[PDB]
Structures are given as structure tokens and as C-alpha cells.
Homo-oligomer: 548 residues x 4
């Protein structure tokens, strides 16, 4: 762009100069030597001289003619044998060499940059989040204060990289944080708090902070973070619900204090092997299966779908409906013993979850935790022989192998399954390239940090236009009033009246559900609506519909 | 600079032109009995060297052929070989040694005068530079570290010299004798070495920033004209702000500043508590409650509740900001005095809920500022 | 490779030549009633584009002038612009991306077959390469470390690929399915990961060098076709040489080899003493006399006098050589069995006074050698 | 060289091609068009075509003539517009860019390399040794196995740098160690032993090893080292002789078991302030002052020379003559107390020397020595306040400030002199750039590691042709027999008869001495000769002279 314009601007200067010299030529040939030449001849002569061809078939004879001829001759050499290669090599090659042998850090962002997503702090989580939304061509800009990292990130793109201090208000100004679509804060908790307070001093751009410690979640929202995601707490929890011999209800949300969302692993449950409509969950519980999660895919629950030992049911309903489901499972086995290998922030949260039930566990680690003081840990290297044995791995019922190193996880899953083919093995994969090999080692289930983290962050980014909306709001369930038995969503006009929105429409005697129904959906009789709105519109709901 | 070699070549070319134009007329006359003008000789010579070659004026003798061949070869060598060979080996060569492979400045120009030498760059001296740009001094920072020299070279408001600060030959190339003033911001043993070395050459005014107030006397002995104990000053500020019976002040951070704060609150005297994750390697006169403050219980354990004031003094601004948030979140009214290492974090410490913020960069640069003006 | 783009251009140029030579004759005829030969058209066209410009054959019409101008401009663009622009941006450009800034090979050519993948380069596998060069295999070493890739690139007898050994997409680009054999010389957890990943793609024979004999069974489970416990073997060798009552053997070095030596001398059984500067991070079944052996008294303290044999087993050949000298200098006849990490130090261990020398590189490469031949 | 030859070989190809085309031109012009042109015309035409000038005044008219003309035209462009710039840029610029932006390690040395000095292991010692003999233009080649060090050393030269494993026999082969003049082994003791044993497997080139531990001196000579230099032991010793309040005799050599060399510091001695001939040392001792060392200069002792508080007398004589001198000093002060700051290998040797007298000392250090177990050390940081005070620095009589850090040394010398203007301060300078500032701090004497080490190594390199000669030999002293009273050294023929050599000739009643007298020196009556020879020629000395 910038260089091309200067390139053909030079072509316009030459073409003008050509016509100039061609005209002066015809002029002088007439007024000095009494020769009349055509316009074409003038162009023909001028080109002949500049290109240094020099046929000599049209030449001057006077000194003044020699003078003009010499000038046109030098002009050609200067502007076709000197400037043209030099001008080329300086405007073209200087960028091409300097920028390719010598990393020039992107210190700023173009002023016209709008609707971009600022990523702070790169890791397998955000690394995956980028790659999964780069398939979507989202304008991603990751920032870092590490020189040796910026150029590394420049090689696999992907994305754009800005090198500067994430907390610096001036660096943020050059990042155009005001025009930003969203901001992912994945630095340490003290750094994130610094980032949020600084961003808030410039704009109100929505920030998603990935809090390094569940306690610091409150402090980050105070800093200005519109959303807070405790990964390890969630990741550890996901390691835990899978670790038990028989699956149990896992409470997710208790909004509105009457409607709850809860997930349930199907492994070890009576629902394992049967289909959804066969087990009759909604039938005996009154719940709403709002999705079946299996192998990284949230699918619409159908009666044909066969629940496997690796499934996960997303459920919604009242408080007495969840307790009705826990009754059907219904009891947990006795004398469970869960070995948790690795005592980091994830391994800790894994035990923390298993303690909220509670279930007797054992922690094994190489060193003393610098953060936790509430858990008892058996100190020892899980690789060195007899270390697991002496800890009493024999009477264990399940093992959570959660180490910061994947090859070690794979090696422990490999060894444990080799010694105890019976016990349940849950493995943790830091990188998603190691997930398959963990299953191949003998693990019954694998929790991938990167993928799980990317899904959460991603969904919070896609549903962003309704994220801070749905935040501070309460989801609710209303049985379709017999008045609208046969009316269309667009015809009913629910939103302009009440203010809420239809997120789900399920049939009377069916586990089948219609997630996010289009306005042209024709409602039926006995259907059960699941809506989302403010804790003010939920009360002005039954008010508005009955009073029109 | 490269101009002088280039237009000298143009001078030689111009001479070679007139020389060839002259011989042309002389030869044309004596060789073949032809009388050509001066412009004809210029026009002919140009036509030959530029290799245009109109052929309208050509010799017919062997002596004329030889000459023509000589002028032709000259046009090739001195326009199609040397002229481009010059180009690349005159200012495309310094282009690689200064833009493709970082070339550190190891010495200043001989005539350099009225410049300010900065030894040991930090947020304080970095701010001292951008605070005196309106006076338009020439700030030169000197570092014995290669990597630091490179980072300080891409961003600029000052000059960057790479070499041993404590070397006499390096100080000589820095033209210290012609310097306006020198700022010593290295460690105490280094500054002592820096002064004694400078004093062997010149008597340039030295403003040394001392690490321990006790060492201040020694730095004067070395040769410093002024000594600035900032952490005593910065520590004194934090202590003054924390106060202006049951009055308990928490000092979170037991470094040289935090220590100076505690040392100040002994003169009042006001009871205090020092919390740190590590035992001070320089101090053994204060009592420190050990344990990391970010973890959690330590603030509640030591009793942040019955405290009247809090002083957050960590070398990490992000940590400070985080602690200021936590304290303000726990006790919504307690006096919180925070420390700012960089001036970029001052606004966020107040946003976090601090009642007063002391900036090391601001206070530091202001003192060093008012010492370079009232020299 | 760049040839094909270059001579295609020569083909285009040749076509453009004949095209211009043809139009020339056609125009000369129809425009000005002149009949020129084919060679005249070639000769004229060349003369114009090369900008020689004899002017002996020139048009006199405007249509002829236009054409001449077009052929002239073409000679400039397609010989003085594109021809050099091609040059620089065709094989002077790969010259910078491969000789001025190290470009690591991240993938092998699609057709690559019969190659041997080496995972984890060391004096053993480095010797395995230079020991099978007469068979002319294609050895490719793979390292996830940038710096190591660069050092292994300047010196060569093998191919160097940079990337994560435990990545499926990286193994796919290494064409493991077409590989002759794979050598796993990484840590035990890594090899387990390496095998399980390879087995998901292909069933290429894997020769895994296991770190702990107990883990050998696990590596077979992972997918290895052969497992080689060298330190057990190397330790066994040292023990066999140390012997073939009051017989005391000193083992200087308590690593996995030294441990294996001690583990072997328990089966005999022959009393021994293990001397090391550090407690073994993997072993807790042997008794080690702690203290550095180079310092001095430790050899005299433990009683190197009443010993019958000495086994020097340190991961440092220079240390070994030095200890072998010291022992031979103290006791001029005592049995000294030394360990050689590299094969370059074997001769100096004997020169130092060793009675027999076991070379890790030699023994290692020979086993791995006879496993790739009798596949 | 290599590139220049290819350059003007191309000029010879062109000149031949010019003459070729010029000849074929005249040939064709005759046989094809009946035109006769001169030799000059042919050159004139051919040049005109190749250079693309193209006057057109001499042109062909036939097709065959057009064919030849076109060939010469293309030939010119290929060989003056294509090959000439390309050939240039590939033979010239490729070395100039690649070798200047990308370090190409010198892996080998040219076969014809003879009489070079191989330096192994670079440090302030060898760094100085190089710079001091690079003023002498000695062919120095330093070797290293550190990639990030080889290119650093390439920037300040000085010297040439070979990058390879010093112990590798193949790397040594490429270094041409056989043709080497000498080898300086300055690696660790285990590495040096490896180096020597390897070099000895190839050649018998003299090796000077710098042993890191005085005990390992025996083991290195066994490895093949022709010479062994314990620097710290020597450096520590030099710190010690200067530390005492009053100087004392320091025994250097006891060769032949009757002649000894010994040095003596003049500080605190009665000789301080007076001249050599005034104190009358040779007079009252019978010794031979073979040199006066002051301020880095070994000068010939003259009666005019004034001994200062910083002088050092190099002496030679029998065993009873040295004891006669210690009598003249003659006694040491009482209750001396020497504080030695820093307990490394040098600080250790300093105490080791002070214990061989003995003199009560105190050691202070930050940490426990990993090598020594014989000395008691007061653990503490000498920078932190009251640390020296509590150790009892008050009743000390002298301080040896010997730290690995010069700025610290300077800062301690500065502080100690400020608190105790009376006590003697000996300081250690790792780098010679810090020597002057140590004196400026208040030190009474400074021992520079680099300079002292360079002098020893240097003298062992210059006197190399007589180093291994004088090694294993015994220096002796013989009173000039009255028979040669008036005869010249060359006339006497001492060497061809006995086998020894005259190294010194001193006068009867004079402290003046003639070091290394020229053969034309006319001997006198009563002169005292100091010779050097084998322990076999010293006995065949008095035998040969008396029996002719
Ligand atoms: N709290 C959150 O929800 C959240 C959110 C976003 C990011 N993060 C960040 O993600 C990080 C993830 O936590 P993590 O990766 O540090 O936890 P981690 O479990 O990976 O920590 C590793 C632990 O495993 C142990 N270990 C390693 N090898 C072992 C072996 N062979 N035998 C026994 N033990 C072994 C070590 O002792 C160590 O304690 C957190 O540190 C946090 O900063 C956290
Ligand atoms: N003589 C003077 O007045 C003067 C003047 C200018 C400069 N200086 C120099 O400036 C330097 C700056 O001092 P400084 O910045 O290192 O002092 P500092 O107070 O910042 O020291 C840092 C301390 O904070 C603590 N810390 C860090 N993170 C913590 C956490 N999460 N929880 C609890 N504690 C934590 C550490 O234990 C550490 O001791 C000084 O070393 C001094 O030499 C001195
Ligand atoms: N299962 C197998 O048989 C097998 C096969 C091939 C490879 N391997 C692997 O090869 C690796 C190589 O083992 P290694 O070379 O580390 O064993 P090692 O014997 O060389 O271990 C080194 C030890 O020598 C000691 N040491 C070093 N300097 C000393 C000194 N100056 N004085 C006294 N002691 C000193 C250290 O304490 C250290 O423990 C092993 O880790 C192993 O995993 C194993
Ligand atoms: N033995 C020989 O003669 C010889 C010959 C050639 C080379 N060398 C090598 O030269 C090296 C020189 O020895 P060195 O430099 O390691 O000895 P060193 O005296 O420099 O070691 C430094 C010591 O000073 C102490 N120290 C540092 N700061 C201090 C402070 N503020 N207060 C108190 N103590 C402080 C440290 O504890 C440390 O022990 C040797 O290690 C050896 O390898 C030796
Ligand atoms: Ca894998
Ligand atoms: Ca900030
Ligand atoms: Ca060797
Ligand atoms: Ca100095
Ligand atoms: K031309
Ligand atoms: K003509
Ligand atoms: K004509
Ligand atoms: K021409
Ligand atoms: K021409
Ligand atoms: K012409
Ligand atoms: Zn815990
Ligand atoms: Zn303190
Ligand atoms: Zn063992
Ligand atoms: Zn000692």
C-alpha cells in the first residue's frame, strides 16, 4: 500500500517526464534545425535515449541540440539506472531483510482497529482458545512483556503479537482497549487485578479474568472484571466427579433459589447402557435434560441416544426434583478410597471437591504446597518404586493422576492399570495432544485442561452480547399456559410484553428438547418453557401474560 | 558523512569528463583533420560512457579507435562497476552492521560536552530522564549488560553506552571530564568503585544514590559531591503518612524501604508489625512475622483487624495493588499507605483504595532533578 | 529446483524473441515495403532488447516507431528489471532464510522412506550414527530444544528435525509409518508417551532404551519391540571386570550405573563401598559414604588402602581420568576399572592407569547396532 | 587470495574472448563481405558490442554476419551484465554477509601453522597474558567448548578463536598440537589432566598447567605437564608476606641443597628509606641481590636505588647467609593479628602461608568452604554492619581483604582505612583495572591476580627454550678463580668445557650486578659468578676448569 503508491507515483513522474522531453524535442528540432517531427517520433526518440538504446538515426547537429540530448541522456541514467534500482532496494528490500532477520516488535495497534479481543498471558488454555477461534477468523491480539516470547509467538500465526507491559495505561491506549470487543485476563491474580483497574480507567470493555485462586474471585470483580473463571477449581471438580465408583449429582447453579442446573456422570449409574427415554429420567424426576455431553460434544438429548460409561447429563429443575434423582441412583458404594497423585492447585481442588461430599482420599506429592495448609499430603515421588505401595494404593478404589507433566501422567496411568485392572483411573492432560495416549494407557476418563478451559472462555466470548446480560439474571421455568396452545413465538409476542426470552421448548411426554427455538416455532399443548430474564421480569412475567 | 566520498567521486567524474572531452577535440583535429566544438566533446563523451552510442560522431583511424575503446571501458568501470560497488560498500554495508546485527555504542564522540552520565538505570532514573527533556540535556545511560543495552536502544529518549562502568578506559571514552554531572545509581560497593575511578580522571560532580545511610559517609570519602538516601526518605514518607494509645500499624514488606519505615516508627514511637516472606539479608534489628502475605491467613492471623494503619511496601506494584484491594475489602476504612515502584501504577493504588500513595520514581526523580538544576 | 522457474522464463523469452522477430518482418514489409530475412529479424530484435542499438536497421514510419518503442521497453522490463528481480527474489531470498537466520526442519519430505528416527541424542546414539554410516542409512535425530537443533545442524552425519517428539502431528510429518526403525532414548515417562503415540499411527519397530529395568515391562506394554537396559548392562560389566576372603571394592559414583554395579556385587557376594557427593534420588537400598571424592581425604578416610579393586563411575570422563590417576598414584597395583562416557576418553583412562575400561558409547552403540541389523 | 584468483582468472577469460571475437570478426568481414579491417578496428568493434555501446558505424550486411554479431552481443550481456555482477555477489558478498551476521566457528587450523601457543580456558589471567604478548605479536590461539564465548572472544582481537572440545584428540589434531610452540592448560584440574594425557598421545609439545589445587600438582606432571603453576598458592603467599607489620624472608627455592633464592619485602624493615649500598646487605650477609622488584618492574639493583615501603628484594645465597639476614631485620613484633576477609582458594592460601611462620589470623566468609576443612572460619557477611567489629577487627594489626569481587574489596579497603588509619591493609585485585582505586582507597599494597599470573606464565613462555632445560637443573655460585683475572667470557670458553652458563657477574665490593652478561664481558678480579647447569655439570665444573 504505502510502498506501492510511491512506486507508481514514480511511474507517473517518468511518464510526465517522457512527454515533457518528447515535447521539448519536437520544439527544439523545429526552432533550432528546421526539422519537423511527429508526436510519435518524439516519444520514439526520447525512449531511445533514456533506455540508452541510441539508434543515432535521429540526432541533433547544433550545440544546443547536443546540450538537450546530453541532459535527456543523463536523466535516463539517473532515473532508470540509479534511482529505479536504489529506490526499489530501499523501499522494498529494507523491510524485507530487516523485518525478517531482526524481529521488530509490534509496540502499538492501528487507530482504526475495532472489535478485537485482547489476550493477556499465553498458555495451553489461551493457546487453544486462539486456535479454536482462529478457525473462526476472530481478530486476536495477544500481549506479552517477554521479548523472547513475542518473536516466538510471531512464528506460529494464527494471531498478532503486541510487545509491551500489559498493566501500563499507555500501552493499553495503543492497544485501543476502548474499541475492544473483549479482554481475556490470564495473568497471575496480582497482575490481573492491576490489569482490570487500569483498563477500567480507560474504558468499560468487558473483561474475563481467569482467577488463579478461588478466594481471589471477589477481589477481581472489584477490580472491574465482568466475569471470573476459576479453572483449576472447575478442572479439579471435573477430575472428582469422574473419580468416584458410582456417579453422583453435581450442583452447578442455584439461581432464583428455586431453579437449579446440575450435571451428572453416567458411569456406575443405572442409566449406564440404556437410552434416555428408556431410563425415564424426566419421568421420575420432573427434571429437564438440557443436554448430553460426551466426547467433547454437547448434543441435544434424544430418546434414541444411548448413554455410555463416559457420558455426562446436564440437568435443570427445582430443588426437590434433583433430590428425587439422587434417590434413583441412588446410594453410593461403601469404603471408597481415592488416590490423588499430584498436589498442585488442580490436585488440591480435586481433593477439595471430594471433601465436600465427603469421600476419603489420599494426597501424594514431591514437595510441600506453598499455597495450601488445609490438606494432609504424603510426601514422596510417585515415580520411585514402592512409593505408591507404601501409601496403600492397594485398597484404593480410584486414582486421580494429576501431574503438571503429561508423560508422567501417561506413565502412571500405564503403571497403575497394569497393577490394578479393576480400579477407576481419571487422568489429567495439560496438553490435548496427550489426551488420546492417556486413554490408550488405561484411563477410564481424561480431563483436558486446554480444551475444557477453551470451551468455557469461548462460550463466554460468543455469548458475550448476552453474557453480562445473563449475568446477574435468573433462569426460570414456566409451564406453557393453555391459552397459547397453537400460537407461534413471534405471534405470542412474549419478549415485547414481559421482557424475557425463550431458550428451550420441550414436549409433554418427551425427553426431547428444542434449544433456542426460532420465532416461527409453533407452540403446542402441555409444553414446558425454559426462559431467561432479570429477577424483575420473572415476576412481571406471570403478571404481563395474564393481564396482557 | 558518506556524502564526502560520493561527491569527490562526482568531482573525479566531472574532471574525467572534461579531460576526455578535451582529448577528443585534440585527437579529432590532429588525427583526422576535424574541428569539433566544446559541447560536441561533452556530448560525445557522455554518449560513450553512458553507453548510449549514437554513432553520429565516430573516429575512422586506429588511434581514434583505441581512444574510443578507452573511453568506453572507462564508462563501464567508473559507472557500471565502481558506482554500484561504491553504493553497496559505502552505505548498504553500514546498514547491516547497525540494523541487522545490534552494534552497541562503546564510546562517545571526542567533542561531546555538557552530557549527563547515568550509571544504573531504573524506574527512578528512567523517570529522571523523561522529566528533564524540556531542558534538552543529553542523557547517556551506561550498562555492562548486553541484553539491557539492546532493550534500551530500541526505545529512546537518551543515549545508550555498553561497557564496564568501573573501567578507567571506558570512562575516558565517555568523556567524563567534559560531563555536566554523573549519577551513581549502582550498588554501594560499585558506586565507591565508580567514584574513585572518576576522581582519578576528573572532578565531575557526582550525585551518588547510596543503598545504606551508613555508607553515605564512605561515598563522600570516595569522591561524591552529593549523597541521596532515598529508601530512608521513602521509608520516612510512608511512616509520616501512616500516622499523620491503641494504634497498630502493619508494614507489609521488610526490604530496605519497609525497614526504614519501621525504623522511623520507633522514633515516634508507634507499635508496628513487619510481615515478610523472607528474613532480611541486611537487617537483624527488627522483628519480622514470617510468611507470605498473598496466601491468605497471614493477614488474619497476625491481626489485621485491630490495626489502625497499613503500609504496603513490596518491590512489586502488582502485589501492592492486590494487597491494597484485599485490605480495603476487609476493612473499609483503615488507613492504607501504598508504595509505587513505577509511576504508571500510582493511579491504580488509589483506585484500589489507598488513602495516600508514595511514588519511588516521582520522589526519586524530583530530588535528583532538583540536584542537577541547583548544581 | 529454482531452475524450472528460470528456464520457463527463458522459454517465454525465446518465444517473445521469435514473436518480435516475426512481427518485425511483417511490419517492415507492410509498413515500409522492405523485405528482411528471418536472421535479420532475430538480429534486429536482439539488438533492440539488449539495448545495443546499431541503428543500421530502423523504421521511418510512426507505426514502426511505436513498435520499436514497444520492443525497447520490453527489453528493459524483461531483462533489466524482471531478470534481476527474479534473481534476488528466487535464490538470494532462500539464501537469507537458510544461512543468516537458522531455519529448523519441522517436517520430512512426503516420499521419505527407510529412515531411522532417533529420539534423544547422546554420546551413545551419536556413536550409533557414525558406526552405521557404511550401511548408508538416513539417520534423523529429533529434539524439542531449539539450541540443540542448531548445534546438531552445523556438524552433520545425520538429519535434524525440531519439534515435540510426543506429538502425533509431528510424528506424522516425520513419516514414522515409512520408517525403518525408531530408537527411543528419552526418559522412561517420555518413551512411554513416545511409544503410545507411535502405536496410534503405525507399527514401526521401536527399540526403547529404558532408564530403570523395572520399567522395561511397562515399555513393552506401551508398544516397544525391544527394550535395552544399558546401565544394568554397563553396571554388570564394571562389576564383572572388578573381580574376574578379604576383598574390598570401591565404587566411586552412585548413579544408575554405579548402583547397578553395586547391585551386581551383591549376587556374588563381594563387599563394597559406595562413595558419592549426593544422595541418590532414585535409590534407597544401598549404603553410601557421602562426600566429594575429588577434595582429598575421602579416599584416604574410607580406606582406599585395604581395598582390592576400584570402580570409577562418574558421569564426567575428566573426573574419571583424574581419579584414575590419583588411585594409580597412591596404590600402584590395585585393580582399577574405569567408565568412559565418550569413546574419545577411552585411551586416556588407560593412559591414566586403568586395568580395564568400559565405554558406554561403544557398548551402547554395539547393542543398538546389532538390533537394527538383526531387526 | 582464493577469491582474487578466480576474479582475475575471469579477466583472463574475457581478454582471451575479446581477442577471439576480434579475430573472428576480421575473418568474417573478409571472407563474407570482402571488407578488410585492422586489428585495432576488431578490438574497437568487439568492445563496442559487448559493452552494448553499438555505434553501428561498422556493421554486417549478411545473415551469417548478423548471426555472429548477435552471438557477440549475447556473450557480452551474459559475461558483463549477468555473470560479472552475479559472480561478484556470490564470491564476495556471501562471505561478507554470512560471516558478519552469522558467526562461523573456526573448527580447525590451517595445516601450515607452526610455532603457535595454544591457550585453554580463558580468564583475567590468560586474558592479560594474551594482551601482553599480543603487543609482541605472538601467534595466540585460544580454544573453548563454549559457543556463546567463542563469538564473544571473536569481537576483541587480539587473538584467534577455535571452537571445539579441548580434550578431544581429533580437535587437538586439527589444532596442530605437534607443531605447537607451547600449551597453556588453564582448565580445572580434572580437565587439565585430561588435556595433558591427550596431548601426550599425539606429541611432546611442552605444556604449562595452571593447577587449581597445590596437592594436584604431582598428578598433573604425571599427566604430562612439563610445568606446573599454583597461582592461588603463590597469590595468597604474596598477600601474606605483605600483610605482616614487619617484612620477613620468604624462601623461594632450595635447589642443590646449598644455594637458595628468597624474596623479602622492605616494609617495616630497617632497610626502608635507605639505599642498597647504604644498608649494606651483601656486606653483612654475603648474599646476592639478584633484583629489586617495585611497582611491577624487576630492576637491576644499584647503590643509588632507594628502597621504599613497597619494595621487594630478590636474594640468592647459601643457607647460613639467609639466616644472617633474618638476624639483621631482625625480630618480628609481638601480638600480631591478621584479619583475612574472604575464604576462597586464595584467601585460604593466604592463611596457609601465615600459618607456616606462624602468625595468628582470623578468617571471615559468607559461606562454608567446599574444599577446605583445616581452617576455622567466622561465618558472616563482611558488608553487613558490625560483622567485622564482632569478630574483633579492633585489636587486629593487619587486614587482608581478598574477595572475588573488586568493588567489594575497594569498598572494604575504603571502610577499614576509614576506621583504622594505623593498621596495614593488603588488597586483592581480580582485574588490573581496579588496582589503582584500591590504592586510592587506602591499601598499603595491592596484589593483582592477572598481572602476577601473566608475569609468571609469560616468563615461562619466553624462557621456554631454557625452561625445561633449567627445569631439573640446579643454579650455583662460584667465586671467579684468579686465573681468569682479565679474561673475556668468550675467551675463557666456559660453556664448551664445563657445560654451564654465566647468568650473573657481580663486582667484589659492590651490590651492583650484571644480569646475563654478553660474551664480550671482560672479567675482573674478585668477581662472583652465578651460573646455572645440570646437577652433573656443577660437579664437572671445578673439575673441568682446574684440569682444562
Ligand atoms: N485457580 C484457578 O482456577 C486457575 C485458573 C486459571 C489459571 N490457573 C493457574 O493454573 C495453574 C495450574 O496449577 P498447577 O499446574 O500449578 O498445579 P499442578 O498440579 O500441575 O502442580 C504440580 C504438582 O505435582 C507434583 N508432582 C510433579 N511430579 C510428581 C510426581 N512424579 N509424583 C508426585 N507429585 C508430582 C508437584 O509436587 C507439584 O506440586 C495454577 O498454578 C494457576 O496459576 C488457575
Ligand atoms: N540508602 C537509601 O535510602 C537508598 C536509596 C535509593 C535506593 N536504595 C536501594 O533501593 C533498593 C530498593 O529496595 P527494595 O525495593 O528491594 O526494598 P523492598 O521493600 O521492595 O524489598 C522487598 C521485600 O518485599 C518482600 N515481598 C515481596 N513479595 C511479597 C509478598 N507477596 N508478601 C510478603 N512480602 C513480599 C520481600 O520479602 C522482600 O524482602 C534497596 O535495595 C536499596 O539498596 C537505597
Ligand atoms: N535401565 C538402564 O539400564 C539404562 C540404560 C540406558 C540409559 N539409562 C540412563 O542413563 C542415565 C545415565 O546415568 P548416569 O550417567 O547419570 O549415572 P552416573 O553414575 O554417571 O551418576 C552420576 C553420579 O556421580 C556422582 N559424582 C559426580 N562427580 C563426582 C565426584 N567428583 N565425586 C563423587 N561423586 C561424583 C554424582 O553424585 C552422581 O550421583 C541414567 O540416568 C539412566 O536413566 C539407563
Ligand atoms: N590453586 C591455584 O593456585 C590456582 C591456579 C590457577 C587457577 N586457580 C583457580 O583460581 C580460582 C581462584 O579462587 P577463587 O577466586 O575461587 O577464591 P575466592 O577468594 O575469590 O573465593 C571467594 C570467597 O570470598 C567470599 N566472599 C565474597 N564476598 C564476601 C563478603 N562480602 N564477605 C565475606 N566473604 C565474601 C566467598 O564466601 C567466597 O568463599 C580458584 O577457584 C581456582 O579454580 C587456582
Ligand atoms: Ca502424545
Ligand atoms: Ca497500572
Ligand atoms: Ca580425551
Ligand atoms: Ca576501577
Ligand atoms: K546500453
Ligand atoms: K548510424
Ligand atoms: K549513415
Ligand atoms: K546502446
Ligand atoms: K547505440
Ligand atoms: K547507433
Ligand atoms: Zn490442598
Ligand atoms: Zn528492619
Ligand atoms: Zn544403589
Ligand atoms: Zn582454609
Amino acid at each position: 500500500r504505502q510502498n506501492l503508491k510511491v512506486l507508481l507515483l514514480y511511474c507517473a513522474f517518468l511518464l510526465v517526464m517522457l512527454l515533457a522531453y518528447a515535447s521539448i524535442f519536437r520544439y527544439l528540432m523545429w526552432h533550432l534545425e528546421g526539422r519537423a517531427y511527429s508526436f510519435m517520433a518524439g516519444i520514439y526518440w526520447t525512449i531511445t535515449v533514456m533506455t540508452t538504446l541510441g539508434f543515432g538515426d535521429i540526432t541533433f547537429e547544433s550545440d544546443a541540440g547536443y546540450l538537450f540530448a546530453s541532459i535527456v541522456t543523463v536523466s535516463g541514467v539517473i532515473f532508470l539506472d540509479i534511482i529505479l534500482p536504489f529506490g526499489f532496494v530501499s523501499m522494498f528490500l529494507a523491510p524485507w531483510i530487516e523485518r525478517r532477520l531482526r524481529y521488530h516488535p509490534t509496540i502499538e495497534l492501528p487507530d482504526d482497529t475495532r472489535g478485537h479481543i485482547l489476550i493477556f498471558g499465553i498458555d495451553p488454555i489461551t493457546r487453544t482458545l486462539i486456535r479454536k477461534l482462529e478457525s473462526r477468523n476472530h481478530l486476536f491480539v495477544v500481549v506479552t512483556d517477554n521479548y523472547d516470547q513475542a518473536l516466538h509467538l510471531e512464528e506460529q500465526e494464527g494471531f498478532k503479537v503486541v510487545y509491551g507491559s500489559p498493566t501500563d495505561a499507555h500501552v493499553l491506549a495503543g492497544l485501543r482497549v476502548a474499541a475492544a470487543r473483549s479482554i481475556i485476563a490470564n495473568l497471575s491474580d496480582p497482575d490481573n487485578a492491576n490489569l482490570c483497574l487500569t483498563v477500567r480507567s480507560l474504558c468499560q470493555t468487558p473483561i474475563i479474568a481467569v482467577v488463579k485462586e478461588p478466594v481471589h474471585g471477589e477481589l477481581l470483580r472489584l477490580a472491574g472484571a465482568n466475569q471470573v473463571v476459576p479453572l483449576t477449581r472447575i478442572l479439579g471438580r471435573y477430575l472428582g466427579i469422574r473419580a468416584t465408583t458410582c456417579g453422583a449429582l453435581a450442583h452447578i447453579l442455584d439461581s432464583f433459589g428455586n431453579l437449579q442446573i446440575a450435571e451428572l456422570p453416567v458411569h456406575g449409574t443405572p442409566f449406564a447402557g440404556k437410552t434416555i427415554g428408556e431410563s425415564g429420567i424426566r419421568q421420575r424426576t420432573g427434571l429437564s435434560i438440557i443436554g448430553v455431553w460426551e466426547r467433547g460434544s454437547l448434543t441435544t438429548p434424544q430418546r434414541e441416544t444411548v448413554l455410555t460409561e463416559q457420558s455426562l447429563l446436564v440437568l435443570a429443575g427445582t430443588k426437590s426434583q434433583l433430590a428425587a434423582l439422587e434417590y434413583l441412583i441412588g446410594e453410593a458404594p461403601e469404603d471408597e478410597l481415592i488416590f490423588i497423585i499430584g498436589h498442585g492447585r488442580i490436585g488440591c481442588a480435586a481433593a477439595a471437591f471430594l471433601d465436600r461430599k465427603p469421600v476419603p482420599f489420599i494426597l501424594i506429592d514431591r514437595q510441600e504446597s506453598p499455597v495450601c495448609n488445609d490438606h494432609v499430603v504424603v510426601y514422596g515421588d510417585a515415580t520411585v518404586g514402592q512409593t505408591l505401595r507404601q501409601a496403600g494404593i492397594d485398597r484404593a478404589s480410584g486414582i486421580i493422576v494429576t501431574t503438571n507433566d503429561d508423560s508422567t501422567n501417561i506413565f502412571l496411568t500405564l503403571a497403575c492399570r497394569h497393577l490394578h485392572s479393576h480400579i477407576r483411573i481419571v487422568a489429567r492432560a495439560n496438553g490435548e495432544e496427550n489426551v488420546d495416549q492417556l486413554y490408550a494407557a488405561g484411563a477410564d476418563f481424561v480431563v483436558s485442561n486446554a480444551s475444557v478451559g477453551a470451551n468455557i472462555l469461548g462460550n463466554l466470548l460468543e455469548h458475550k452480547e448476552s453474557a453480562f446480560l445473563s449475568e446477574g439474571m435468573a433462569v426460570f421455568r414456566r409451564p406453557l399456559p393453555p391459552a397459547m396452545a397453537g400460537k407461534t413465538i413471534a405471534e405470542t409476542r412474549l419478549r415485547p410484553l414481559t421482557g424475557c426470552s425463550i431458550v428451550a421448548i420441550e414436549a409433554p411426554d418427551r425427553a426431547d428438547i428444542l434449544i433456542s427455538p426460532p420465532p416461527e416455532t409453533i407452540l403446542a399443548e402441555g409444553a414446558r418453557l425454559i426462559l431467561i430474564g432479570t429477577s424483575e421480569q420473572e415476576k412481571t412475567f406471570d403478571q404481563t401474560i395474564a393481564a396482557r
